[PDB]
């Protein structure tokens, strides 16, 4: 059988909340008397990446999907856009909406935010669904060969900024490199929208420079090790989506994690790179919905 | 004795996370270095009359925090997180192993937070007018309460600190008992002639742990104060009357409660104690260093 056509629209009412003096944009749909499901995107995406996942979940659960500070339709203060900046703003976003307990659905740098938050707020986490997530990559050989020269250049002084900031390579090159199917022009224009001006591309370059690869930056490596240790020892319900060949999470790693993470169901989406949501949204959405029905939530 | 206004130190610069940081670096390379950390709105200039008491016998390193002094001015928010990251990297870029700290104001938060995380490397801490949690506004001096509330008031605080440069033109001299001279003022004004460069001056008072906010800073500061209370590291506390961040009663109580701590009364003092009695501070640091178990 064949997949349904993948929607290009973003049929959600926009919201903004003031966070530390800046406005962050977010989606907020579904019923509000239960446990919210908080969807966190990564680099170089926005809440747009969840547009075809949310409709599977919204009939039964609240869906909140923010745009990270400096990204999407959120404000763009003059920050370095280190992980520290994202942590601060995301923590404050969650408090600004008065969220208590949540289910997380997280991806890429959004997964570092989600796992780091959950480790610090273990009483408030009712489940985590995750995919293509940030983990330590101890050698460049564990980074995919098709992306090695590129990410090394991204992290090389002067060259990386020329590619990402001046030439917009993370949007024009790396984003398509992360989707097995071809993105349409309408989809590309949605992803391009926040970054038309090169000055606004700082987060796109800082993010690959924060990835924990070959021990650097050491502070990120430590933080990520800490939340991975937490995840390995946590009874929290877990749902892991993976694809072939993946980028951050190759199939062999997914298979290891299906055993070494407690209470974890792993689901193969088929072909996939980084943005698994773009390659099989209906499997990811339908499986999240089924998994939510099994959790200690509905209030 | 007359207090020197000059800054007779050759520039040193080091690349840190892709940005350049300026620092004073004098004295011999064959011992344990003494790392001097300034706060808001100062620079290594604040240590200019203290360093010469120490440099004959110990290397003195005095960086300008990122965004301040002669250090580069990247487009950051200048949150404490930014200062932590850059200072950690500065220390590693100089290849420092064990150190003695001499710290003040926001420099004290940096130093104590670093020491907590590097307990085997810290061999002594001299400190003054330091950051601790302030649970209510009542515990902030009245001559400055309305001002700091305004600094932390949306839009108003930026008008004062960024547009009008009040932290330099007002708060700085407010923090010295004696009158700062025009030459000294001009040294302190140097990094902030352009209003956009005043961001760190505004973010700092907005990071102060007062009445529980920002909660992340409150937690961090509580953690390093607990660490300090539990550490056998040699400690030297300078204080003055009436103080600003530290009233005399609190200073004297800490001298008793902290392990291995000597307190030194500098006389009249507000925040920038270094400007009111540099010769006592410098000479006492020198004497104290000679008593430590450092190498050599
Ligand atoms: Na639409
Ligand atoms: Na590092
Ligand atoms: Na020198
Ligand atoms: Na005054
Ligand atoms: Na004065
Ligand atoms: Na807070």
From Swiss-Prot, chain A:
GO MF annotations in UniProt: haloalkane dehalogenase activity
Protein name: Haloalkane dehalogenase
Disulfide bonds: none
Species in which this protein is naturally found: Rhodococcus sp
NCBIfam families: PRK03592.1
General function of this protein: Catalyzes hydrolytic cleavage of carbon-halogen bonds in halogenated aliphatic compounds, leading to the formation of the corresponding primary alcohols, halide ions and protons.
KW Hydrolase (keyword) present: yes
Keywords annotated in UniProt: Detoxification, Hydrolase
GO process terms (BP): response to toxic substance
Enzyme Commission identifier(s): 3.8.1.5
Domain AB hydrolase-1 positions: 36-160
Catalyzed chemical reaction(s): 1-haloalkane + H2O = a halide anion + a primary alcohol + H(+)
Catalytic machinery residues: 108 (nucleophile), 132 (proton donor), 274 (proton acceptor)
UniProt KW Isomerase keyword: no
GO cellular component term of the entry, any: membrane
Pathway participation: Xenobiotic degradation; haloalkane degradation
UniProtKB/Swiss-Prot annotation, chain B:
Enzyme class: hydrolase
Gene Ontology biological process terms in this record: response to toxic substance
Gene Ontology CC terms: membrane
Catalysed reaction, written as an equation: 1-haloalkane + H2O = a halide anion + a primary alcohol + H(+)
UniProt cross-references to SUPFAM superfamilies, sorted A to Z: alpha/beta-Hydrolases
Active site: 105 (nucleophile), 129 (proton donor), 271 (proton acceptor)
Pathway: Xenobiotic degradation; haloalkane degradation
Domain (AB hydrolase-1): residue spans on this chain: 33-157
Keywords: Detoxification, Hydrolase
Any one GO molecular-function label of the UniProt entry: haloalkane dehalogenase activity
EC numbers for this chain: 3.8.1.5
The organism's place on the tree of life at top rank: Bacteria
Pfam families hit by this protein: Abhydrolase_1
Assembly notes: Monomer.
Described function: Catalyzes hydrolytic cleavage of carbon-halogen bonds in halogenated aliphatic compounds, leading to the formation of the corresponding primary alcohols, halide ions and protons.
Similarity comment: Belongs to the haloalkane dehalogenase family. Type 2 subfamily.
The protein's name: Haloalkane dehalogenase
